[PDB]
Scaffold this active site. Structure first.
Site, PDB file in Angstrom:
ATOM      1  N   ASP A  35      -6.648 -14.980  -6.080  1.00  0.00           N
ATOM      2  CA  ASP A  35      -6.679 -13.698  -5.652  1.00  0.00           C
ATOM      3  C   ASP A  35      -8.018 -13.540  -4.711  1.00  0.00           C
ATOM      4  OD1 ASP A  35      -7.036 -10.871  -5.703  1.00  0.00           O
ATOM      5  OD2 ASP A  35      -7.811 -10.717  -7.756  1.00  0.00           O
ATOM      6  N   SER A 199      -6.885  -3.689  11.422  1.00  0.00           N
ATOM      7  CA  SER A 199      -5.672  -3.996  12.313  1.00  0.00           C
ATOM      8  C   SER A 199      -5.602  -3.164  13.461  1.00  0.00           C
ATOM      9  CB  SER A 199      -4.545  -3.965  11.329  1.00  0.00           C
ATOM     10  OG  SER A 199      -3.340  -3.770  12.141  1.00  0.00           O
TER      11      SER A 199
END
Length: 330
Positions: A35, A199
């Protein structure tokens, strides 16, 4: 040193991935959820409330000759989905794919929430976010990657998750045969303890690319792709019959639909998520309404590049003095 381990979807929908981890002496092998969105290594154990264990493999520290109780140490964690767990702490030897850390904090569960009990395929979590998020009290503990970093050939790990198939977590090296073209690196903020990056934008199917900054985290421990509501609305508008359903808790779509791809930007580079990756199947057994793999991050407070996005890429988690993230097509 290096390590390399195969990671496997837990079910037919790629709801999560498990990776075998050796703990203790002799080795006790547990299948953990790697994770990159958390920083505790915790396991079902001989100490877990019996009624809360249902099919999982447990760690029994009394059977490990290298296990040592970390005096006075406790841990307790609550995850973004609403699940939680807590217990005490041992140090012990932990190996992943041939890579060994001695003295790793192994967090032993005394209690786990129902969602963990109900998931028989996950024996615990292995956190790979930054150690600043580790919940051990009164003395914070380091992650597996942080403990291994100095010994690794290169201070990196990579995530190569498969679509309906096995993939690979590598430690200490970049497998240049595992991706196409080149790796584009992008800046990371560690200010929230996450692999947080920005992004450069998106496109829906064959549509024009929208340049826009989307701040989010690379999170292997989250199944879906959570993005701003404007983006997600633009995506599902291209699917006939798709709608946001309050009762189900997100966007649903007719199972007979063909989903468009979703492209996200990494600097000037582009990662294409095939439309099939965005189908998470019927909302209930036998239903012709299917759950979408792209959902709104509104009310999460952060955008999450979870497995839906990461499995479309070869992803480099670069733990140099200044961390960065790298993405390649594959």
């Amino acid at each position: 040193s290096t390590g390399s381990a195969t990671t496997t979807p837990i079910d037919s929908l790629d709801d999560a991935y498990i990776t075998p981890v050796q703990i203790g002496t002799p080795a006790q092998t547990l299948n953990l959820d790697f994770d990159t969105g958390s920083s505790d290594l915790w396991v079902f154990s001989s100490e877990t409330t019996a009624s809360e264990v249902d099919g999982q493999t447990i760690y029994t520290p009394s059977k490990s000759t290298t296990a040592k109780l970390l005096s006075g140490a406790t841990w307790s964690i609550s995850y973004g989905d609403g699940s939680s767990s807590s217990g005490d702490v041992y140090t012990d030897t932990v190996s992943v794919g041939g890579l060994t850390v001695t003295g790793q904090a192994v967090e032993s569960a005394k209690k786990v929430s129902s969602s963990f009990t109900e998931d028989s395929t996950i024996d615990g979590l292995l956190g790979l976010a930054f150690s600043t998020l580790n919940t051990v009290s009164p003395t914070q503990q380091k992650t597996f990657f942080d403990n291994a970093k100095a010994s690794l050939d290169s201070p990196v790990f990579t995530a190569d998750l498969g679509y309906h198939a096995p993939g690979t977590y590598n430690f200490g090296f970049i497998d240049t045969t595992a991706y196409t073209g080149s790796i584009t690196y992008t800046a990371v903020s560690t200010k929230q303890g996450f692999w947080e990056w920005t992004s450069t934008g998106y496109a829906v199917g064959s549509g024009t690319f929208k340049s826009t900054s989307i701040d989010g985290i690379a999170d292997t421990g989250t199944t879906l792709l959570y993005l701003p509501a404007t983006v997600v609305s633009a995506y599902w508008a291209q699917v006939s019959g798709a709608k946001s359903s309050s009762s189900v808790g997100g966007y649903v779509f007719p199972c007979s639909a063909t989903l468009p791809s979703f492209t996200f930007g990494v600097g000037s580079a582009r990662i294409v998520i095939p439309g099939d990756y965005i189908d998470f199947g019927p909302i209930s057994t036998g239903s012709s309404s299917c759950f979408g793999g792209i959902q709104s991050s509104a009310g999460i407070g952060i955008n999450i590049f979870g497995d839906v996005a990461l499995k479309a890429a070869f992803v480099v988690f670069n733990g140099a003095t200044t961390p960065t993230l790298g993405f390649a097509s594959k």
